[PDB]
């Protein structure tokens, strides 16, 4: 009879969490930002077009310098681009062409790529030989890698379709922490600015906040109706936004432990593939399956703009660390810089 | 204009573009096959014949044509999150074991393995990413099926079966029950073969079906189809 008592205590704990969330929900974000001025109409133009990829681009990640970016495509190539001059700085051929995620290290010395091979390949960009070579192959996950972010040159957090996330030491090649609890394929992750916490979104329609040092799940956030494909923190690290297949984006607050806003429109039925915030966090940019990117007002839930330059699904998206530009990658094999 | 180091960086980018173009041409000259089919359907034997965790890639060359075969059977995750990676494959090879007509799933009680194979074939054939992709259907274990059919009847799997309890009629009925699951009959063809286990017959069938797919795609590109 233990199982029934455990599951009733679990449903009582869930009712207590829901009642505490209802208790602290004294107002809404829409009622407080009702008297601030609207952003207006954001019209961004394509400053640059990055051609060279010959298959679908699945992931792009900006560098901390806000000039160099890495892209990953399923033809079998990682390309580091100089976005000011559209020069290809590096072309790295991959051992497995089924890449789904790419990352740029904060220092700029390494890049990583993960995919259906279930391995995270760490490439060293600053060698004495003048070529890029494999520095590490992090093996251990039993599912495809969906997102990888560097914390520093020696530590990387990865998310997988095995329903778990992991923290790795790149020197030894061994998982240092394992984050378990998700019952669905983890599709994305996002590091906090301080890098002490990360959120992960999975296919069980929930997001989880994780403590890097302690290895525990601090908070769980629900509200979506389908697979959470994308997640990203607000710039101060006290909130984050999720994008899902239910054609809505949601803003969640860590301290209030609740959903603050829903960004949706009746004319949108396609799922969100990517989300990022601007430099001040006032604009929320989301990529969709309608071949377009929508710019929303992160405080008023109004659509402020549309980035419509692609012929296929906008798979990925990123905003520079100075906030000067937005890069969008798509399945039509082209990367576009917007401003 | 540009400085000297800027000009040399542009020249390096041009050489990178040239090497990317050459690798893209060499990749476009290859035939991509996605190997699917439920567990213990004969896929391993097929791979062994053709060749002489995560995704496994087999490279072979038959008649100056290079084939890359991608097996994704080890991926135990949600299939709809990575199946769109294989949207532009040249063909799909689906393996079905005939001997499993009267067997049942170990994982799920009272679930016929043929009904699970029909469900998987119906899921990927009418999938939104494989609308134009042709399917090569291999019905494996014909010999085992022939031996089994004399003892055990086909009516365990299909209760609406009314024909003879021999090899040819039951095999044609099973082939009909897989080929009628194709809803988009106009866009895609299903090439059915009964694996012989002999020397090069299977790869020859694959070669012929891929040649037919390349013809149909050239016809579509040339506007004639």
């Amino acid at each position: 009879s233990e199982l029934d008592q455990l599951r009733q205590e679990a449903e009582q704990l869930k009712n207590q969490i829901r009642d505490a969330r209802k208790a602290c929900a004294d107002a809404t974000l829409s009622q407080i930002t009702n008297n601030i001025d609207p952003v207006g109409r954001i019209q961004m133009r394509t400053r640059r077009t990055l051609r060279g990829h010959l298959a679908k681009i699945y992931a792009m990640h900006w560098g901390t310098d806000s000039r160099l970016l890495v892209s990953a495509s399923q033809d079998g190539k990682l390309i580091i681009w100089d976005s000011y001059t559209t020069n290809k700085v590096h072309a790295i051929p991959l051992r497995s062409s089924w890449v789904m995620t790419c990352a740029y290290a904060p220092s700029g010395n390494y890049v990583a790529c993960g995919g259906l091979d279930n391995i995270c390949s760490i490439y060293n960009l600053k060698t004495r030989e003048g070529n890029v070579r494999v520095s590490r192959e992090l093996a251990g996950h039993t599912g495809y890698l969906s997102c990888c972010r560097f914390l520093d040159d020696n530590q990387i957090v990865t998310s997988s379709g095995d329903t778990t996330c992991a923290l790795w030491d790149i020197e030894t090649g061994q998982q240092t922490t394992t984050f378990t609890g998700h019952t669905g394929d983890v599709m994305s992750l996002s590091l906090a600015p301080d890098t002490r916490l990360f959120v992960s979104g999975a296919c069980d329609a929930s997001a989880k906040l994780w403590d890097v040092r302690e290895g525990m799940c601090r908070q769980t956030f629900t509200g979506h109706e389908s697979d959470i494909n994308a997640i990203c923190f607000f710039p101060n690290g006290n909130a984050f936004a999720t994008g899902s297949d239910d054609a809505t984006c949601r803003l969640f607050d860590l301290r209030a432990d609740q959903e603050l806003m829903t960004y949706s429109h009746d004319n949108i039925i396609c799922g969100i593939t990517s989300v990022s915030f601007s430099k001040s966090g006032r604009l929320l940019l989301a990529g969709y399956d309608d071949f377009n990117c929508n710019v929303w007002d992160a405080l008023k839930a109004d659509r402020a703009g549309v980035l419509a330059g692609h012929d296929n699904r906008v798979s990925c998206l990123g905003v520079t660390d100075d906030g000067m530009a937005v890069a969008t990658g798509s399945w039509d094999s082209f990367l576009k810089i917007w401003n | 204009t540009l400085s000297a180091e800027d000009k040399a960086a542009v020249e390096r980018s041009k050489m990178i573009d040239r090497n990317l173009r050459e690798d893209g041409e060499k990749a476009a000259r290859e035939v991509k096959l996605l190997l699917l089919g439920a567990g213990e359907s004969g896929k391993n034997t097929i791979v062994k014949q053709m060749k002489i965790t995560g995704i496994v890639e087999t490279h072979f060359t038959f008649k100056d044509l290079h084939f890359k075969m991608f097996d994704v059977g080890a991926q135990r995750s949600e299939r709809k999150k990575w199946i769109h990676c294989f949207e532009g494959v040249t063909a799909i090879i689906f393996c079905v074991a005939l001997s499993d007509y009267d067997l049942v799933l170990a994982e799920d009680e009272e679930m016929n393995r043929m009904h699970a194979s029909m469900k998987l074939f119906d899921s990927i054939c009418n999938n939104k990413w494989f609308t134009d992709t042709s399917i090569i259907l291999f019905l494996n274990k014909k010999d085992l099926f022939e031996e089994k059919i004399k003892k055990s009847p086909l009516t365990i799997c299909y209760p609406e079966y009314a024909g003879s309890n021999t090899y040819e009629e039951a095999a044609a009925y099973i082939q009909c029950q897989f080929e009628d699951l194709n809803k988009r009959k106009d866009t895609k063809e299903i090439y059915t073969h009964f694996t012989c286990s002999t020397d090069t017959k299977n790869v020859q069938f694959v070669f012929d079906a891929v040649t037919d797919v390349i013809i149909k795609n050239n016809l579509k590109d040339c506007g004639l189809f």
Partner: single-chain antibody
Amino acid sequence: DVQLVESGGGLVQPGGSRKLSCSASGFAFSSFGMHWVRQAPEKGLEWVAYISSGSGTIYYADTVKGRFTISRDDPKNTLFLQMTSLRSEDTAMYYCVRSIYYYGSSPFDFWGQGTTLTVSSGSDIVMTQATSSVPVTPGESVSISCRSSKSLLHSNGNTYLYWFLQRPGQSPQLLIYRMSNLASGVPDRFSGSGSGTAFTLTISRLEAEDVGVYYCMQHLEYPLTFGAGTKLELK
């Protein structure tokens, strides 16, 4: 391990011909542009020739133009310099130098050991190192200065000046690239500054391994020109 080895030197008669070779090992040779730099037996460094990665771009100094021919064999990892109609002024030690060019790269970062050639008997940028010898004592901080006839600050934000150190009996070593960036494997005591036309290299806490000749070089436009060199000696 990166190695550039030069062969083919020796005594030649005027009007003759010789072919110098440079064997490369330990790096991806075909992705690097290669240079030939000469050093007269008592003078400073002079740039001779340059071939790009992929052999698409070839430059020559005016003194050697029409006589010298630079080439490369990328499957054999060899750089060649075919010199014809030699003159007495071509007696010098010849160095092959590797330089790769991309955003954030450090060109001129490895120099070969050099091969000795003995020949028996207007709008170029001028780099000026006014003092030719500074006596120094270990522990102190020293500043070496270079000036340019043309502003080396480009419109892209880069200032194309490079600092090199040649120890006694060795090949030159890259110290600073693009005015302020410190080269890989160089200690943090070296620092470069300047403003378009006037530049300074500061060595804090001078050690005994810092004596030798210091050369400034511009990489704004071809031909590349060196400074006369400032010598640091003890006492």
